Design an enzyme around this catalytic site. Structure first.
Site, PDB file in Angstrom:
ATOM      1  N   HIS A 154       0.823  -1.206   0.000  1.00 46.34           N
ATOM      2  CA  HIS A 154       0.000   0.000   0.000  1.00 46.34           C
ATOM      3  C   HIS A 154       0.858   1.257   0.000  1.00 46.34           C
ATOM      4  O   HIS A 154       0.694   2.133  -0.859  1.00 46.34           O
ATOM      5  CB  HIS A 154      -0.952  -0.003   1.195  1.00 46.34           C
ATOM      6  CG  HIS A 154      -1.586   1.327   1.455  1.00 46.34           C
ATOM      7  ND1 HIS A 154      -2.801   1.692   0.917  1.00 46.34           N
ATOM      8  CD2 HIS A 154      -1.195   2.362   2.234  1.00 46.34           C
ATOM      9  CE1 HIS A 154      -3.112   2.908   1.326  1.00 46.34           C
ATOM     10  NE2 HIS A 154      -2.160   3.332   2.135  1.00 46.34           N
ATOM     11  N   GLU A 155       1.784   1.364   0.957  1.00 51.82           N
ATOM     12  CA  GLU A 155       2.597   2.570   1.062  1.00 51.82           C
ATOM     13  C   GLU A 155       3.448   2.787  -0.181  1.00 51.82           C
ATOM     14  O   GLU A 155       3.753   3.934  -0.528  1.00 51.82           O
ATOM     15  CB  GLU A 155       3.479   2.509   2.308  1.00 51.82           C
ATOM     16  CG  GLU A 155       2.705   2.542   3.615  1.00 51.82           C
ATOM     17  CD  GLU A 155       1.706   3.683   3.679  1.00 51.82           C
ATOM     18  OE1 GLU A 155       2.040   4.803   3.236  1.00 51.82           O
ATOM     19  OE2 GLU A 155       0.584   3.462   4.180  1.00 51.82           O
TER      20      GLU A 155
ATOM     21  N   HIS B  23       1.650   5.064  -2.872  1.00 55.47           N
ATOM     22  CA  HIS B  23       1.860   6.503  -2.777  1.00 55.47           C
ATOM     23  C   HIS B  23       3.250   6.895  -3.264  1.00 55.47           C
ATOM     24  O   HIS B  23       3.444   8.017  -3.748  1.00 55.47           O
ATOM     25  CB  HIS B  23       1.655   6.967  -1.335  1.00 55.47           C
ATOM     26  CG  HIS B  23       0.252   6.799  -0.836  1.00 55.47           C
ATOM     27  ND1 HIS B  23      -0.854   7.098  -1.602  1.00 55.47           N
ATOM     28  CD2 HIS B  23      -0.223   6.346   0.348  1.00 55.47           C
ATOM     29  CE1 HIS B  23      -1.949   6.850  -0.906  1.00 55.47           C
ATOM     30  NE2 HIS B  23      -1.594   6.389   0.280  1.00 55.47           N
TER      31      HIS B  23
ATOM     32  N   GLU C 115      -6.312   7.485  -2.275  1.00 50.01           N
ATOM     33  CA  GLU C 115      -6.204   6.099  -1.839  1.00 50.01           C
ATOM     34  C   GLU C 115      -6.480   5.100  -2.956  1.00 50.01           C
ATOM     35  O   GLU C 115      -6.618   3.905  -2.673  1.00 50.01           O
ATOM     36  CB  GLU C 115      -7.167   5.843  -0.675  1.00 50.01           C
ATOM     37  CG  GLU C 115      -6.811   6.581   0.600  1.00 50.01           C
ATOM     38  CD  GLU C 115      -5.488   6.132   1.175  1.00 50.01           C
ATOM     39  OE1 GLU C 115      -5.174   4.929   1.061  1.00 50.01           O
ATOM     40  OE2 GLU C 115      -4.760   6.978   1.734  1.00 50.01           O
TER      41      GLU C 115
ATOM     42  N   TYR D 106     -11.372   5.957   2.231  1.00 52.13           N
ATOM     43  CA  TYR D 106     -10.732   4.645   2.260  1.00 52.13           C
ATOM     44  C   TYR D 106     -11.632   3.577   1.652  1.00 52.13           C
ATOM     45  O   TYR D 106     -11.160   2.703   0.917  1.00 52.13           O
ATOM     46  CB  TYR D 106     -10.349   4.279   3.692  1.00 52.13           C
ATOM     47  CG  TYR D 106      -9.128   5.011   4.196  1.00 52.13           C
ATOM     48  CD1 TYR D 106      -7.851   4.542   3.915  1.00 52.13           C
ATOM     49  CD2 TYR D 106      -9.249   6.170   4.950  1.00 52.13           C
ATOM     50  CE1 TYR D 106      -6.729   5.207   4.373  1.00 52.13           C
ATOM     51  CE2 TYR D 106      -8.133   6.842   5.412  1.00 52.13           C
ATOM     52  CZ  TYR D 106      -6.876   6.355   5.120  1.00 52.13           C
ATOM     53  OH  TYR D 106      -5.762   7.020   5.578  1.00 52.13           O
TER      54      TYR D 106
END
Ligand SMILES: [Zn+2]
EC number: 3.4.24.16
Lengths: 665, 4
Positions: free
Chosen positions: A460-461, A464, A489, A599
Site C-alpha cells: 500500500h505505502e 503513494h 487512496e 478509504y
C-alpha cells in the site's frame, strides 16, 4: 537534467535545531518578497509572467524548503530537532494562512482569468487560475474585511490545534508492565525481545510491533483488557480538550463561508461532491455487510464460550473490545489454516523488498537502484533512484524507513518531499518521496519477518511512492499525490491486490532458513483467506467513517459518546467505557477531517480497474501497466479524479467488481 | 492506510 541524478536532491537532513529556526525566518522573508512584489503591481498591469508564473516559481521553492523543516519532526531521533521542527511547522502553517488571506493577490488573479485570452496558455494554467480563485472564495476573500480577519483568526487557531493533536501522539511513551505468566500463549521470540524490569517483569510499549501481537495471541483476557484500555486512552486528557475546540471551530468557519457544516465544506473539493451521497454510500454498504457481521459475531462468541469453559474463565456472554483481535485470529486459523506466526518465516524483509521492487520494475516499466553512502536522517534508512526503463529518464528518488524507534511516526504513511514539476529555468524537478512504516525488527537471531498484513502495508505505502514519482505536472500544487482526498487512496489500495495473487506471492516468498518456497496447499489457502473476518473489519471502517461524518455534522456532540454509539449500532461490539478512540484518531488532524470515507470510497474504483482491466489481460501485463502509469499516476492532480478514471476504464466506474470481491452482490 |  532529466537523465542525470547529481544535485537534483537538494534536501539536507543534518540541520541543527538552531539552523532550522534560522532557515525558517530566512524562508519567510524571501517568500514574502515575492508575494509583496505581486501585490504592489497595477491591476491593469498584471500579466502571465509577473503574476501567475511569479507565484508558481515561489510555490515550488517554498514547499521544498518547507519540507526540510516540517519533516524531521516525524523521523529524527533527536528530540530537540523534532521540537525545533514543530515550531517551524507552527510558524509556517500560520504564514501560509497569512499569504492565502491576501486580498490584493486575489484581486489580481481574478483579473487575469476575466480579461486575458485563455487560449494562449496551457490547459494546466487555466486549471491553475480556476483552482486558485476557488481557494480564494473558500477563504472568504470575496467577503467583507471584518469577517476575513475573523476567519484568518480562527484558522490560525485550528492550525496549532492540529499540530499539537499529532505531537502528543507522536511523543507518547506510555507503557505497561506484565509478568511471564500474564503473557500466556505468546511466542518466545517476542518475550525474549522485551525490556526486563528489576522484579523480572517485562515492558511492553503501545506501538504496532508490540500492541498487535499481544492483542492477537495473548490467551490471558486481563492482559488484553489492560492493553486495550491503555491503547485507547492515549492522550485522553489533552486531545479531548483539542476536540472540544477544533470541532466547534471547524463548523464556525464553515458557516461564515456559507456552508451549513464543515462536512459540506470539504466534500465540495472531493469526488463524492455531497455529504448526502456519502451517508447514502455508507448506510447501504452497511446493510449488505450486516448479515456477514452477525455470522462472524456468533462464531466468535462460540469460540469465547468454549475457550472460557476449557480454561476455566468467567464467560460474560458479550464480545469485548479487547476480545475482537484475539478471536478474529482464531477464525483465521480454524477456517483457513493460516498460522501467521509460521507464515512470517517465508517473508523476510530482504526477499519481500526485492520481490516488491521487481514486481513494479516490470509492471510500470521502471528501474530501481539503491545509492550507496546515502545522506539520510537515520542510519537505518536506504535510498533508491527511479529511472524510466525505456528512456533512462531519472524520474525520482524515495527513502525507505521501515523500522520503529524513539520519536518516530507510529503509524504508516508516505510523505511527498519534492514535487515533480517545472522549474523557472525550463527544467524538471526530481520527485522525492519517503516510505515510513513500523515493521517488525530482527529478533532471535533472525532477519525481520513480516506478517502477511505487514506485506500489504508495504505494498500500500509503495503505491503513494509510485504516484509521487510517476506524477509529472507543471505546477507544484498539482504534482505528487495532491489530488482529491477521496481519490488519493486509489493508487495505494490497488497495489494490495498483488499480495493476494498465487503467482505473485511465490515471487515474494523464500524461507529464511532452508530457502524453500511456501507449500502449494498453504498458498491456495492464503489467497482463499482474503474475505476472512471481512464483516467486522469493514464494519469497523464504516463506524470510523460514520463517526467522522457525525463529528463534523452535529455541533454540540460528545466525541466519545458518538464513537460508542456507532460501535453498538453498526459493529455490534461495544466501546469500552472510559476510553476515547477519537482522542487517538490522528486522521482528524492529518488532512482526513470529514474525508475518512475515502478509504472505502477509493476501494470501489481500484477493484473496478483491477477486475476489468488487469485481471483480464494479466496482472503483470506491461501494456496495462503502462496505461495505468500514464493515465492515473502521471497526471497526478492536473486532471479531475473521475476524468482519469474515465480515460482508463473508457466508461464510468461501478460497484459490480467491488461487490463481488467482497462476497456480496 | 487506515487505523488497523
Ligand atoms: Zn495510503
Amino acid at each position: 537534467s532529466s537523465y542525470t541524478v547529481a544535485g537534483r536532491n537538494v534536501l539536507r537532513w543534518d540541520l541543527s535545531p538552531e539552523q532550522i529556526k534560522t532557515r525558517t525566518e530566512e524562508l519567510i522573508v524571501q517568500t514574502k518578497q515575492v508575494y509583496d512584489a505581486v501585490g504592489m503591481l497595477g491591476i491593469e498591469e498584471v500579466t502571465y509572467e509577473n503574476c501567475l508564473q511569479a507565484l508558481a516559481d515561489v510555490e515550488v521553492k517554498y514547499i521544498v524548503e518547507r519540507t526540510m523543516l516540517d519533516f524531521p519532526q516525524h523521523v529524527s531521533s533527536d528530540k530537540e530537532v523534532r521540537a525545533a521542527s514543530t515550531e517551524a511547522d507552527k510558524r509556517l502553517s500560520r504564514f501560509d494562512i497569512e499569504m492565502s488571506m491576501r486580498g490584493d493577490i486575489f484581486e489580481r488573479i481574478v483579473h487575469l482569468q476575466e480579461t486575458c485570452d485563455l487560449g494562449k496558455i496551457k490547459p494546466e494554467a487555466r486549471r491553475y487560475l480556476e483552482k486558485s480563485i476557488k481557494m480564494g472564495k473558500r477563504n472568504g476573500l470575496h467577503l467583507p474585511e471584518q469577517v476575513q480577519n475573523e476567519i484568518k483568526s480562527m484558522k490560525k487557531r485550528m492550525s496549532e490545534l492540529c499540530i499539537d493533536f499529532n505531537k502528543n501522539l507522536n511523543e507518547d511513551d506510555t507503557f505497561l508492565v506484565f509478568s511471564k505468566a500474564e503473557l500466556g500463549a505468546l511466542p518466545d521470540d517476542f518475550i525474549d525481545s522485551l525490556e526486563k524490569t528489576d522484579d523480572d517483569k517485562y515492558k511492553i510499549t503501545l506501538k504496532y510491533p508490540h500492541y498487535f501481537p499481544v492483542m492477537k495471541k495473548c490467551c490471558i483476557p486481563e492482559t488484553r483488557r489492560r492493553m486495550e484500555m491503555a491503547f485507547n486512552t492515549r492522550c485522553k486528557e489533552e486531545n479531548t480538550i483539542i476536540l472540544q475546540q477544533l470541532l466547534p471551530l471547524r463548523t464556525k468557519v464553515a458557516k461564515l463561508l456559507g456552508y451549513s457544516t464543515h462536512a459540506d465544506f470539504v466534500l465540495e473539493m472531493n469526488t463524492a461532491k455531497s455529504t448526502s451521497r456519502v451517508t447514502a454510500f455508507l448506510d447501504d454498504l452497511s446493510q449488505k455487510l450486516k448479515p456477514l457481521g452477525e455470522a462472524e459475531r456468533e462464531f466468535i462468541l462460540n469460540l469465547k464460550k468454549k475457550e472460557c469453559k476449557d480454561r476455566g474463565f468467567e464467560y460474560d456472554g458479550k464480545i469485548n473490545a479487547w476480545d475482537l483481535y484475539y478471536y478474529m485470529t482464531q477464525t483465521e486459523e480454524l477456517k483457513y489454516s493460516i498460522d501467521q506466526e509460521f507464515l512470517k518465516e517465508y517473508f523476510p524483509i530482504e526477499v519481500v523488498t526485492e520481490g516488491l521492487l521487481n514486481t513494479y520494475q516490470e509492471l510500470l516499466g521502471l528501474s530501481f537502484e539503491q545509492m550507496t553512502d546515502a545522506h539520510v536522517w537515520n542510519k537505518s534508512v536506504t535510498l533508491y533512484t527511479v529511472k524510466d526503463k525505456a528512456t533512462g529518464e531519472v524520474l525520482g528518488q524515495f527513502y525507505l524507513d521501515l523500522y520503529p524507534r524513539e520519536g518516530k511516526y507510529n503509524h504508516a504513511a508516505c510523505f511527498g518531499l519534492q514535487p515533480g514539476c517545472l522549474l523557472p529555468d525550463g527544467s524538471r524537478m526530481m520527485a522525492v518521496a519517503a516510505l515510513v512504516v513500523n515493521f517488525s525488527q530482527p529478533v532471535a537471531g533472525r532477519p525481520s519477518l513480516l506478517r502477511h498484513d505487514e506485506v500489504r502495508t508495504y505494498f500500500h505505502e509503495f503505491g503513494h511512492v509510485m504516484h509521487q514519482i510517476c506524477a509529472q505536472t507543471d505546477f507544484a500544487r498539482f504534482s505528487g499525490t495532491n489530488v482529491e482526498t477521496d481519490f488519493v487512496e486509489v493508487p495505494s489500495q490497488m497495489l494490495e491486490n498483488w499480495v493476494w495473487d498465487v503467482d505473485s506471492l511465490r515471487r515474494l516468498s523464500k524461507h529464511y532458513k532452508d530457502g524453500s518456497p511456501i507449500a502449494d496447499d498453504l498458498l491456495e489457502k492464503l489467497v482463499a483467506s482474503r474475505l476472512v473476518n471481512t464483516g467486522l473489519l469493514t464494519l469497523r471502517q464504516i463506524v470510523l467513517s460514520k463517526v467522522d461524518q457525525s463529528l463534523h455534522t452535529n455541533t454540540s456532540l460528545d466525541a466519545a459518546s458518538e464513537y460508542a454509539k456507532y460501535c453498538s449500532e453498526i459493529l455490534g461490539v461495544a466501546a469500552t467505557p472510559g476510553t476515547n478512540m477519537p482522542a487517538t484518531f490522528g486522521h482528524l488532524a492529518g488532512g482526513y477531517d470529514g474525508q475518512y470515507y475515502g478509504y472505502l470510497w477509493s476501494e470501489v474504483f481500484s477493484m473496478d480497474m483491477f477486475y476489468s482491466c488487469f485481471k483480464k489481460e494479466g496482472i503483470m501485463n506491461p501494456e496495462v501497466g503502462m496505461k495505468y502509469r500514464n493515465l492515473i499516476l502521471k497526471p497526478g492532480g492536473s486532471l479531475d479524479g473521475m476524468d482519469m478514471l474515465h480515460n482508463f476504464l473508457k466508461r464510468e466506474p461501478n460497484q459490480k467488481a467491488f461487490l463481488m470481491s467482497r462476497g456480496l452482490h | 492506510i487506515h487505523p488497523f
